Amino acid sequence: SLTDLVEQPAKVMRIGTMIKQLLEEVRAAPLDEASRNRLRDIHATSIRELEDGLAPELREELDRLTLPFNEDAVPSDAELRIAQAQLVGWLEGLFHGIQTALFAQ
Amino acid sequence: SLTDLVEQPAKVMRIGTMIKQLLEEVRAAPLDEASRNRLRDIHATSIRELEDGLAPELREELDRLTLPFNEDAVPSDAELRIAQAQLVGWLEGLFHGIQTALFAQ
Amino acid sequence: SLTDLVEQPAKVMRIGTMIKQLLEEVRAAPLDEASRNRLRDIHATSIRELEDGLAPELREELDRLTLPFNEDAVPSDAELRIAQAQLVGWLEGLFHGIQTALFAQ
Amino acid sequence: SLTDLVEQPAKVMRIGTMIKQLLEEVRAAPLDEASRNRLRDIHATSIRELEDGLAPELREELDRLTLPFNEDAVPSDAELRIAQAQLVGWLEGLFHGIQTALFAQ
Amino acid sequence: SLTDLVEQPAKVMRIGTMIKQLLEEVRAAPLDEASRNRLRDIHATSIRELEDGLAPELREELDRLTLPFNEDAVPSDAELRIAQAQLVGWLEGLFHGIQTALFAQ
Amino acid sequence: SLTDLVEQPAKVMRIGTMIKQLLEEVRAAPLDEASRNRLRDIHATSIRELEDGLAPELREELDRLTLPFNEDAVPSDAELRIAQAQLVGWLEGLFHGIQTALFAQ
Amino acid sequence: SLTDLVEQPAKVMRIGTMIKQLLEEVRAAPLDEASRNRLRDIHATSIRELEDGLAPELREELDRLTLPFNEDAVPSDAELRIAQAQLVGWLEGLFHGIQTALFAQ
Amino acid sequence: SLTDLVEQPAKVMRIGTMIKQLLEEVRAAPLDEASRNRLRDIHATSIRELEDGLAPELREELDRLTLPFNEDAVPSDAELRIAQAQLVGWLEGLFHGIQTALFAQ
Amino acid sequence: SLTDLVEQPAKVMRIGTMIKQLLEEVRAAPLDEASRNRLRDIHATSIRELEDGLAPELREELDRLTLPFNEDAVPSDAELRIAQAQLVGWLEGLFHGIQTALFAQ
Amino acid sequence: SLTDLVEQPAKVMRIGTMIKQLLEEVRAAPLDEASRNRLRDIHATSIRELEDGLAPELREELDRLTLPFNEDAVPSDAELRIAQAQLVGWLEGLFHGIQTALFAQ
Amino acid sequence: SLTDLVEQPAKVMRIGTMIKQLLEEVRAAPLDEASRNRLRDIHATSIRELEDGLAPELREELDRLTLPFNEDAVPSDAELRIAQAQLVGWLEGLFHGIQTALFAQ
Amino acid sequence: SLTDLVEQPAKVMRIGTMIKQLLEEVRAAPLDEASRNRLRDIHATSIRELEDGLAPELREELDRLTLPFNEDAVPSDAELRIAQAQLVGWLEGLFHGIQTALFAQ
C-alpha cells in the first residue's frame, strides 16, 4: 500500500531535515566556490542515501524527476537552490501523502 | 464520479507540492540560464508524471490548458513563473473540487 | 433553478482557481513579451473551457461581458490584468450567488 | 415591496462582484489606453446587464444617477474610477437596503 | 414622529452609500477636470434624489445647509471633498438620530 | 432639568455629526479659497440651525462662546479648524452632560 | 462638602470638553495670527463661563492659578498651549477629586 | 497617622494633575520666553497652593526639597522640566504612600 | 528584623519616586548648566532626607555606597545619571528585599 | 530498533546543542581567520565525539554524509556555515525520527 | 546546605539590583571620564559589600572570578560593562541556584 | 547515572549564567583591547571553575572540546564570541540532557 512504499521512514525523514536545513542556510546568505562544491557533493550523496531508503517505484520516480549535476562545472547558487527546493518539495509531498493514508485508517 | 477521476492521489499530491515549492523558490530570488534550463526540464517531466496519474478526461483538459515549452530557447523567469503558477492553480482547484465532493458525502 | 445553471461545478471551480493564481502571479511581478503571449493563449483556452461547463444562459452572459483579445497584437500587462480581474470577479460572484441559494435551502 | 424590486438577485450580485474586482484592480496599478478602452466597454455592457436585472423604478433611478461615457474619447483613469466607485456604492447600498427589510421580517 | 420623517429609508440609505463610496474614492487619489465635472453632476443628481426621499421639513433643512455648485466653473477637488463630506456627515447624523428613537422603543 | 434643555435632540445630533465630519475632512487635506468660503457659509448656517434647536439658556451660552466670522475676508484653514473644533467640543460636552443625567436616572 | 463645590456640573463638563478639543486641535497643527487671536478670545470667555459655574472657593483658587492674557499683544502658540494645558489639567483634577468622594459614598 | 498628613486631598490631587498636564505639554514641544515666564509663575503659585494643603511636617519636607526659581532670570526649558518632574514625582510618591496605608486597613 | 530596618516607609517611598521621576526626566532630554546645578542640589538634599528615614545600619551602608558630589564643579549629565541610577537601584533592591520578608510571613 | 541506534542520547543532545549555538553565533556576525580556525577544530572534534556516541550504522551514514575539512587551508565563513547547517539538520532529523517511534509506543 | 551559603539575602539582593540598574544605565548612553571613575569606585565598594554578605566559600569563588581594577588608570566603558555584566550574571546564577533548592523542598 | 555526573549543580548553573550574560554583553557592543584581555582571563578562570564542578568523564569531554587561548596574543572579539558560544551551548545541552532524565523519572 501507500505506507509500504517507504521502506525505513526514519532515514528518509532525517535526510529530508538535513536537506531542508541546508536549503534554509543557502537562502540565508550567498555562497562561494568551495561552499557550492561541498553543496554539490552533499546533494549527490544525500540523493543516493534517499534512494537507498525508498521502494523501487519511488526510486524510479525520483530518478526521473531529479537530474544529477555535471561534475565538470561548479553549479551556481541558483542551480543548487532549484535542486534543493525540488527535493524538499518532493519529500514534503511524499510524507503528506503517506500521512493522509495513515490518518485515513 | 468526481473522486474516481484522480487515479492515484498521492503521486499527484507530491508532484503538486514539488511544483509549489519550486514556484516559491523561483519567486524568492532571480535565476540564471542553467537554473531556468533545469527548471524547464523539471516542468516537462513533472507534467508527464502528473498526466500519468490522471484520468483521460483530466489528461485531455490539462493538455488543452498547458502548452509545452520551446526546446530551442531558454525561457525567461517570467514564462516559468507563468507556467508554474498555472499548474499550481490548476492542481489547487482540482483538489479543492474533489474534496468538496468528499466532504459532501 | 440557480443551482441547475452550473452544469459541472468542479471544472468551473478549478478553472477559476487557475485563473486566480495566474492573476496573483501577474500582479506579483511584471511580465515580458513571451509571458504575455502565453497568458493570452491561456486566457482564450480557459474561457473556452469555462464556457463548455456553463448553461447557455450563462454562456451568453459571459460572452456579452468578455471580449476576446486581438490575435494580431501582444496585450500589455494592464490589459491582461483587466481581463483576468473581470473573469475572476465574475466567477467569484457566480459562486457566491449559487451558494446563497444553496444555504437558503 | 423592497424585496420585489430586485427581479433576479444572483445576476445583480455577480455583476456587482465583477465590477468591484475591476475597481480594486484599477486602484492597484495604473492603466494605459487599451486597458481603459476595454474598461469603458465593460462598463457599458455591465450597466446594460445590471439594468436588465432590475425593476423599472430602479432602472430609472440608476439611469438618472449614471451617465454613459462619450464614445469618441478615451476616458482617463480617474473618470473610470469615479464611475466604478459610483456604481459599486449604489449596489452596496441597494443590497444593504434590501437585506435590512429581509432581516426585519 | 422621528421615524415618520424618512419617507422611504432604502433609497436614502443607498444614495448615502453611493456618496460615501465616491468620497472615499476621491480621497484615495487626485482627480482631473472631467472627473470633477462628472462628480459635480453626480452631486447635483444625488442631492435631488435624496430630497425626493425626505420629508418637507428635512428637505428645507438640507436645502438651507447645502449650496448648489456653480455650473459655469469646474470645482476643485477640495470643494467637492467639502460638499461630499458635509452630505455624508448629515446623512450619518440623520440615520443615527432616527435609530436612536427606534432603539428607544 | 438638564434633559429639557435640548429641545429636539435629533437635529442637534445630526448637525454635530455634519460638523465633525467636516472637521475631519479639513484636517485630512488642505483647502483653497473657494473651499474655505463654502466652509464659512456652512459654519454660519450650521450655527443658526444649532441655535434654532437649543434652549434660550444654551443659545446665549453658545452665543457668548462662539464669534461669527468676518464676512469681508476669507478665513485661513487654521481659523476654520479652530472654530469647528470649538463647536465640536462644545457639542460633545453637551451630549456627555445630558447623558450623564439620563444614565443617573 | 466636595460635591457641593461644583454648582452645576454639566456646564463645567462641557466647557472642559470644549477646551480639551481646542487644545488637541492646536497641538495637531500650527496656528497663525488670527487663529491665535480667536483662541485668546475663546480662552477669556471660557474662563469667565467656568468661573460662573464654580463655588467662590474654587473661583478664587482658579483666579490665583490662572493669569489673564495681555490684550495688547498676540500670544504665541506655546503660551496658548501652556494656558490651555493648565486649565485642562485643573479641570481633570477637579472632576477626579469630586468623583473620588462620589465613589467613596 | 499617614492619612492625617494630607489635610484636604482633593486640592492636592487637582494641583498635581494640573502640574502633570503642564509637564506633559512642556515635554511635547519646546517653549519660548513668555511661555517659560508664565510657567515659572504657575510653578510658584502651584507650590504655594500645594503647601497650603499639606501638614506642617510635609510642608517643611517639601520646602527642603524644592528650591524657588530666581525671579531675575527666565528659566530655560530644562530647568522647568526638572522642577516639574521633581514635584510630580514627589506627589506621585506621596499619594502612593498614603494609599498603601489606606489599603493596609 | 528586616522590616524594622525601614523606620518610616512612606517617606522613603516618596523620595524614591521623586528620584526615579527625575532620572526618567534626565534620560528623556539633555540638560544645561543650571539644570544640572539644581539636580546636584536635589541629589544632596534627597540623600539627606533618605538617610533621615533609615536605620543606622542602612545609613552606614548607603554612606559607603554613595559618594557626595564635588561642590566646586558642575557635574556632567552622565555623572548625574550614574548617581541617580545607583540610588534608584539601591532603593528598588531595598524595597524588594523587605517585601520578600513581608510576603514570607 | 530505532531507539537502540542512539547509544547514549545525552552526549548526542549536548553536542548538537553546542553545534547549534555555534551556528547561530556564526550567522550573527562575520568571523576572521583565527575564529574560523578554531571553528574548524571544534567541528572536527565535535564530529568525533558525535561518532563515538552513535551506532555503527549511523556512524557509517554520517561518515558518508559529512566530509572532513582540508587541514591545509582556512575554510571561509560560508563553508563552515554549510558544514554546521548540514550537521545540525542531520541531528534534528535523527532526534525527530527517534522521538516519532518513542511517541508511537 | 545551599541556602546556608547566603548569609543575609536582603543585602545581596539590593546590591545586585543596584549593580543591574547601573549596568542598564551604562548601556543606555555613553559615559565620560568622571562618570567612569565614579563607576569604578562604585564597583570596588559594591564588591566589598557583596563579599561581606557571602559565605567564605562563595567569597573565595567570587574573588577568583572577579579581578579588581587598576587604580592608576581610568577604565573604558567596555571594561566596566564587562565587569558589571560578569557580576550581574554571577548573582543571577547564584539566586537561581538557591531558589532551585528552595523550590525543591 | 546521568544525574550523578553533575557533582554540584548550583555552581555549574551560576557559572553558566555568568558566561551567558557575558556573551550577551559582548554581542551587544564591540570591545577594546583591555576588555578582551579581561574576557580571556574570565574565560580561563570560568573554565577551571566549571571543570572543578564536573565528573571526570565530563571533565575530559569538555577538555577535548575546548581549547585554551594563547596567552601571548589578545584574542579578537570574534574568537571570544566563538569560545563563549561554544561553552554556553555545551552547558545548555548538558542541563537539557540531565533534566530529560530527571523528568523521565
CA-CA distances (angstroms) from residue D81 to A8, D23, D27, E21, E32?
A: 61, 7, 8, 11, 11
- Cα separation of the two ends of chain G: 12
C5 to A71, B29, C57, C98: CA distances (angstroms): 59, 44, 8, 9
Resolution reading in Å: 3.2
For residue B27, which residues of chain A lie inside 8 Å, CB to CB?
A: none
B103: amino acid identity, one letter:
F
Between CA B101 and CA B9 the distance in angstroms is 15
CA angle D41, D47, D52 (to 5 degrees): 130
Cβ–Cβ under 8 Å, residues G66 and G28: no
Name the H helices within chain I. 9-28, 33-52, 56-65, 77-104
DSSP codes of every residue in G21-42: HHHHHHHHS---HHHHHHHHHH
Quick one: DSSP state of residue F54?
A: B
Do the beta carbons of residue K85 and residue L22 sit within 8 Å?
Answer: yes
Optimal mutation site among G65, G67, G74, interface H, most CBs of chain H within 10 A? G65
Q: Which amino acid is at D102?
A: L
Q: How many CA atoms lie within 13 A of H19 on its CB side?
A: 30
Q: Would you say D31 and C78 are in contact if contact means Cβ atoms under 8 Å apart?
A: yes
Closest CA to D81 of F30, E38, E40: E38
- Three-state DSSP at K27 gives helix
Chains that touch H (3 or more CB pairs under 8 A): G, I
Q: Which helix (H) or strand (E) holds K7?
A: none
Task: Give dist(CA A19, CA A14) in Å, integer.
Answer: 9
Question: Which residues of chain L does J11 touch, with a Cβ-Cβ cutoff of 8 Å?
Answer: 61, 97
- Point out the residue among J65, J81, J96 whose CB comes nearest to the CB of A13: J96
Grouping H, G, I as helix, E, B as strand and the rest as coil, residue C55 is: coil
- Nearest to K75, CA basis, from K43, K49, K27: K43
- Residues of E with a Cβ under 8 Å from any D Cβ are 9-11, 13-22, 24-26, 28-32, 34-35, 38-39, 41-42, 45-46, 49
Please answer whether residues G98 and G5 qualify as being in contact, where contact means their C-beta atoms are separated by less than 8 angstroms: yes
Q: How many CA atoms lie within 13 A of C1 on its CB side?
A: 9
Single-letter amino acid code for the residue at C2: L
Q: Give all chains having 3 or more CB-to-CB distances under 8 Å with chain A.
A: B, J
Q: Are J31 and J79 in contact (CB under 8 A)?
A: no
Of D10, D39, D46, the CB nearest to C65: D46
| Burial of H101 per CB tally in 10 Å (0-12, 13-18, 19+) | middle
Residues near K57 by beta carbon (within 8 Å), at least 6 away in sequence: K5
Please tell me the distance from the alpha carbon of residue L42 to that of residue L50, in angstroms, as a whole number.
Answer: 12
The nearest CA of chain D is from the CA of C3 a distance in Å of 11
Q: Are G20 and F92 in contact (CB under 8 A)?
A: no
Start-end of H helices in chain H: 9-28, 33-52, 56-65, 77-104
What residues in G contact F81, CB-CB < 8 Å? 25, 28-29, 35
Whole-number Å distance between alpha carbons of B2 and A95: 24
In 3D, which of G26, I34, I31, G70 has the Cα closest to residue H29? Answer: G26
User: Residue B81 and residue C22: Cβ atoms within 8 Å?
Assistant: no
- The β-bridge partners of B54 are B6
Query: Rounded to whole angstroms, how far apart are CA atoms I79 and I40?
Result: 10
Question: How far apart are the C-alpha atoms of K83 and K92, rounded to whole Å?
Answer: 14
Rounded Cα–Cα distance for residues G90 and F30 (Å): 34
Give how many domains chain B has, as a whole number. 1
**Distance between alpha carbon E9 and the CA centroid of its chain, in Å?**
14
Q: How far apart are CA C43 and CA C83, in angstroms?
A: 8
Q: Which residues of D32-50 are buried (b: 16+ CB within 10 A; e: fewer)?
A: eebbbebbbebbeebbebb
Element housing E62 (H / E): helix E56-65
- D26: cell is 484599477
Place of cell 485643573: G90
Picking from J22, E46, I43, the residue whose alpha carbon sits closest to that of residue D82 is E46
From chain J, the residues in CB contact with A53 under 8 A are: none
Burial of B102 (0-12, 13-18, 19+ CB in 10 A): exposed
Q: Which member of E10, E29, E42 has the closest CB to residue D86?
A: E42
Helix axis angle for J33-52 and L77-104, nearest 10°, is 20
Q: Which residues of H touch I9 (CB under 8 A)?
A: 97, 100
Q: Where do we find the cell 556512524?
A: J59
Q: Is H31 strand, coil or helix? A: coil
Instruction: Decide if K79 contacts L38 (C-beta within 8 A).
Output: yes
Q: What span, in angstroms and rounded, lies between the C-alpha atoms of K65 and K72?
A: 21
Q: Which residue has the cell 561541498?
A: A38
Q: Residue L3, class by beta-carbon neighbours within 10 Å (0-12 exposed, 13-18 middle, 19+ buried)?
A: exposed
Distance CA D97, CA E13 (A): 7
Nearest-Cα distance to chain H for I43, in Å, is 9
E65, E76, E97: residue with CB nearest F46: E65
Task: Provide the experimental method for this PDB entry.
Answer: cryo-EM
Domain that holds residue K88: 3-104
Cell 547601573 appears where?
A: K22
CA D63/CA J10 separation, integer angstroms: 80
* C-alpha grid cell, residue B8: 492515484
Q: Which residues of I touch H30 (CB under 8 A)?
A: none
Residues of chain F in contact with residue G46, where contact means CB-CB under 8 angstroms, are: 65
Which residues of F are less than 8 Å from G18 in CB distance? 65, 86, 89-90, 93
C-alpha cell at A6: 517507504
Burial F92-104 (b: 16+ CB within 10 A, else e): bbbbebbeeeeee
Residue B30 burial by Cβ neighbours in a 10 Å radius (0-12, 13-18, 19+): exposed
Which of D67, D76, D89 lies closest to E32 in CB terms?
Answer: D76
- The answer for residues whose C-beta is within 8 angstroms of residue C66's C-beta and 6 or more apart is C47, C83, C86, C87, C90
Cα separation, C26 vs C87, whole angstroms: 14
Instruction: Say which residues have a Cβ less than 8 Å from residue A17's Cβ, sequence separation at least 6.
Output: J89, J90, J92, J93, J96
Pairwise CB contact (< 8 Å): A78 & B28: no
| Distance from the I91 Cα atom to the nearest Cα atom in chain K, whole angstroms | 8
Q: Are F55 and F4 in contact (CB under 8 A)?
A: yes
- Which H helix or E strand runs over K26? helix K9-28
CA dihedral D40, D44, D45, D51 (to 10 degrees): 150
**Nine-digit cell string for K8:** 543575609
How many angstroms separate the Cα of L90 from the Cα of each of H71, J11, J12, J14, L54? 66, 10, 11, 6, 13
Q: Chain A residues contacting B, CB < 8 Å?
A: 2, 27, 61, 64-65, 67, 75-76, 78-79, 81-83, 85-86, 88-90, 92-94, 96-98, 100-101
Residue in E61, E76, E79 nearest the CB of F49: E61
Helix, coil or strand: residue D54:
strand
SS3 call for C92: helix
Q: What does R_g of chain G's alpha carbons equal in angstroms?
A: 15
What stretch of H or E contains K6? none
Q: Does the distance separating the beta carbons of I41 and H82 come in below 8 Å? A: no
Neighbour subunits, E (≥3 Cβ pairs < 8 A): D, F
Nearest C-alpha neighbor of D15 from the set D92, D80, D104: D92
State the Cα–Cα distance between residues H75 and H81, nearest whole angstrom: 10
Please name the residues in contact with G78: beta carbons below 8 A apart, sequence gap of 6 or more.
Answer: H29, H30, H31, H32, H34, H35
Map residue F29 onto helix, strand or coil: coil
Please name the amino acid found at residue B21: Q
Q: Is L91 exposed, middle or buried (0-12, 13-18, 19+ CB in 10 A)?
A: buried
Coil, strand or helix: which one is H29? coil
- Which chain D residues contact residue E9 at CB under 8 A? 97, 100
Amino acid letter, residue C67: L
Question: Which residue in F17, F29, F32 is closest to E93 by CB distance?
Answer: F17
What cell numbers appear for J72 in the block? Answer: 591545509
Q: What would the grid cell of residue D67 be?
A: 451617465
Q: CA-CA distance, K16 to A67, in Å (whole number)?
A: 62
CB count in 10 Å sphere of residue D104: 7
